Enzyme design. Structure first.
Site, PDB file in Angstrom:
ATOM      1  CG  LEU A 128     -12.822  18.322   3.160  1.00 14.85           C
ATOM      2  CD1 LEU A 128     -12.322  18.681   4.466  1.00 14.85           C
ATOM      3  CD2 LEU A 128     -13.449  19.293   2.612  1.00 14.85           C
ATOM      4  N   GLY A 159      -5.445  11.077  -1.173  1.00 20.81           N
ATOM      5  CA  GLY A 159      -3.662  10.868  -1.521  1.00 20.81           C
ATOM      6  C   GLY A 159      -3.175   9.509  -1.589  1.00 20.81           C
ATOM      7  CD  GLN A 160       2.535   7.470  -2.170  1.00 18.75           C
ATOM      8  OE1 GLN A 160       2.751   8.562  -2.590  1.00 18.75           O
ATOM      9  NE2 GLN A 160       3.512   6.382  -1.950  1.00 18.75           N
ATOM     10  CG  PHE A 161       0.622   7.481   2.315  1.00 16.18           C
ATOM     11  CD1 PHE A 161       1.072   8.491   1.833  1.00 16.18           C
ATOM     12  CD2 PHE A 161       1.428   6.391   2.356  1.00 16.18           C
ATOM     13  CE1 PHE A 161       2.542   8.595   1.252  1.00 16.18           C
ATOM     14  CE2 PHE A 161       2.665   6.133   2.160  1.00 16.18           C
ATOM     15  CZ  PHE A 161       3.246   7.331   1.455  1.00 16.18           C
ATOM     16  N   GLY A 162      -4.117   7.707   1.658  1.00 12.75           N
ATOM     17  CA  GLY A 162      -5.453   7.943   2.300  1.00 12.75           C
ATOM     18  C   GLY A 162      -6.325   9.132   1.749  1.00 12.75           C
ATOM     19  CB  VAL A 222      -8.609  14.815   4.405  1.00 15.84           C
ATOM     20  CG1 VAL A 222      -9.109  15.914   5.447  1.00 15.84           C
ATOM     21  CG2 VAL A 222      -7.470  14.291   4.889  1.00 15.84           C
ATOM     22  CE  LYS A 247      -3.207  12.456   6.509  1.00 15.32           C
ATOM     23  NZ  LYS A 247      -3.540  13.712   5.731  1.00 15.32           N
ATOM     24  CG  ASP A 304       5.981  16.628   4.337  1.00 18.14           C
ATOM     25  OD1 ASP A 304       6.872  17.245   3.878  1.00 18.14           O
ATOM     26  OD2 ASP A 304       4.741  15.983   4.132  1.00 18.14           O
TER      27      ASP A 304
END
Ligand SMILES: CN1CCN([C@H]2CC[C@@H](n3cc(-c4ccc(Oc5ccccc5)cc4)c4c(N)ncnc43)CC2)CC1
Ligand SMILES: [Ca+2]
Ligand SMILES: [Cl-]
Length: 431
Positions: A186, A189-192, A194, A208, A299
């Site tokens: 889907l 990102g920088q950290f993983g 989805v 995630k 956040d």
């Protein structure tokens, strides 16, 4: 000898759970939370059933027009959900008058539009007006179904209600990776990333996937064990966790993705201002819950807000924003790294602006240091064309230099929920 009755049809999807259609009765054998061991009276089969799918025989919950554990605002939201029409109604637990009931009816007003009116229900015997007495709730509704006692619109069909979400598998918090089939990416990102995935070839979920790094495994899992307890209708359901690195976070699947993307879409552009205010009200409700628990989000923005198929807004990435952007960040958190619930309030102000401008980037045309220098001068975003003055005032109150002078999420929620309703007009007063 405790007998329950099914409220909705249900198909078995696990090893030892039962299948029942609407109307089937059952005998409780064990009360183990969300799942109950029980014996069907239709199939004589013993097995587990979801608690929220059944109700004790001839309890009020068995009625089509009754709703348990539902707030006034939730009653309004459900009654205004599509499918329903003029005269659609429900009877519910009173929020303010404990141990008593309330009637919520769908009415139309030439001024506001489609609205929901509420009436208190008095005890000892039930009545809305002291003139017409009724022996049961059922007689009470049966009277107004044709010809009202002088209330807005007459009663019609009960409020429409869908099947509740089937609760997670009995004791399946830490699952093996093999149970998952991550079918479609889907986002990344920088950290993983989805994924839309399935659990045991029957349960559609979201995953995630976290890339191994600063996220300390044991510490993260502690934080997640904290996150599991923070359940609320406005927080996305956290189902399961794969503990072996790389760590997988298994949650409820939100059909329409993030609030940002939805707003930027066409259907999101079709949404009028009251609906946007409703979205923000749901978000503020979730943040009010988070505030009541004293935890911090860190956040808050439209990208970290998810949207269901039925336009219900839920909060995501809560707490996760720690175990691992300044345009959504309060000055004290930017300068001294002091993230509190008030900084979350600031973030909510920015998110409010983000909502009212249909997903527009905050401070359009300005860079990060540009904004940083702007805030020192005491600069704020101007009021957009479509934004009400009174909502902009809320935004401005969220953006006060002192975090101490910023409103709580409790207050903000209360204000947003009854935005178009004068306090004296919450519950109708009948002669
Ligand atoms: C660019 N980004 C912002 C996010 N996002 C998209 C947000 C929209 C979308 N998405 C995120 C998720 C998602 C899933 C798990 C998740 O994990 C949590 C961790 C802690 C607390 C709550 C949830 C957070 C978000 C999601 C979902 N559950 N259902 C439907 N859509 C979802 C993934 C694509 C991607 C990386
Ligand atoms: Ca009144
Ligand atoms: Cl029996």
């Amino acid at each position: 000898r405790i007998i329950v009755v099914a409220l909705y049809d249900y198909e078995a999807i696990h090893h030892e759970d039962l299948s029942f259609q609407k109307g089937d009765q059952m005998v409780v054998l064990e009360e183990s939370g969300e799942w109950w061991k029980a014996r069907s009276l239709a199939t004589r089969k013993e097995g587990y059933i979801p608690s929220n799918y059944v109700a004790r025989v001839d309890s009020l919950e068995t009625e089509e027009w009754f709703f348990k554990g539902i707030s006034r605002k939730d009653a309004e939201r459900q009654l205004l959900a599509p499918g329903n029409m003029l005269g659609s109604f429900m009877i519910r637990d009173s929020e303010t008058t404990k141990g008593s009931y309330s009637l919520s009816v769908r009415d139309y007003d030439p001024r506001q539009g489609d609205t929901v009116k509420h009436y208190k229900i008095r005890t000892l015997g039930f009545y809305i007006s002291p003139r017409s007495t009724f022996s049961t709730l059922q007689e009470l509704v049966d009277h107004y179904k044709k010809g009202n006692d002088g209330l807005c619109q007459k009663l019609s069909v009960p409020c429409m209600s869908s099947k509740p979400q089937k609760p997670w598998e009995k004791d399946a918090w830490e699952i093996p990776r093999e149970s998952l089939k991550l079918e479609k990416k889907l986002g990344a990102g920088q950290f993983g990333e989805v994924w839309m995935a399935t659990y045991n070839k029957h349960t559609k979920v979201a995953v995630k996937t976290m890339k191994p790094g600063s996220m300390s495994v044991e510490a993260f899992l502690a934080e997640a064990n904290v996150m599991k307890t923070l359940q609320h209708d406005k927080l996305v359901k956290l189902h399961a966790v794969v503990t072996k690195e790389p760590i997988y976070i298994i949650t409820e699947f939100m059909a329409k993705g993030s609030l940002l993307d939805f707003l930027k879409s066409d259907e999101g552009s079709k949404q009028p201002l009251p609906k946007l205010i409703d979205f923000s009200a749901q978000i503020a409700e979730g943040m009010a819950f988070i505030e009541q628990r004293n935890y911090i989000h860190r956040d808050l923005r439209a990208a970290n807000i998810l949207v269901s198929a039925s336009l219900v807004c839920k909060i995501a990435d809560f707490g996760l924003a720690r175990v691992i952007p300044i345009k959504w960040t309060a000055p004290e958190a930017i300068n001294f790294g002091s993230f509190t619930i008030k900084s979350d309030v600031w973030s909510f102000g920015i998110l409010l602006m983000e909502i009212v401008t249909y997903g527009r980037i905050p401070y359009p045309g300005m860079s990060n240091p540009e904004v940083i220098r702007a805030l020192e001068r005491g600069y704020r975003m101007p009021r957009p064309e479509n934004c009400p003055e009174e909502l902009y005032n809320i935004m401005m109150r969220c953006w006060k230099n002192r975090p101490e002078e910023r409103p709580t999420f409790e207050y903000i929620q209360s204000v947003l929920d009854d935005f178009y309703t004068a306090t004296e007009s919450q519950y109708e007063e009948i002669p």
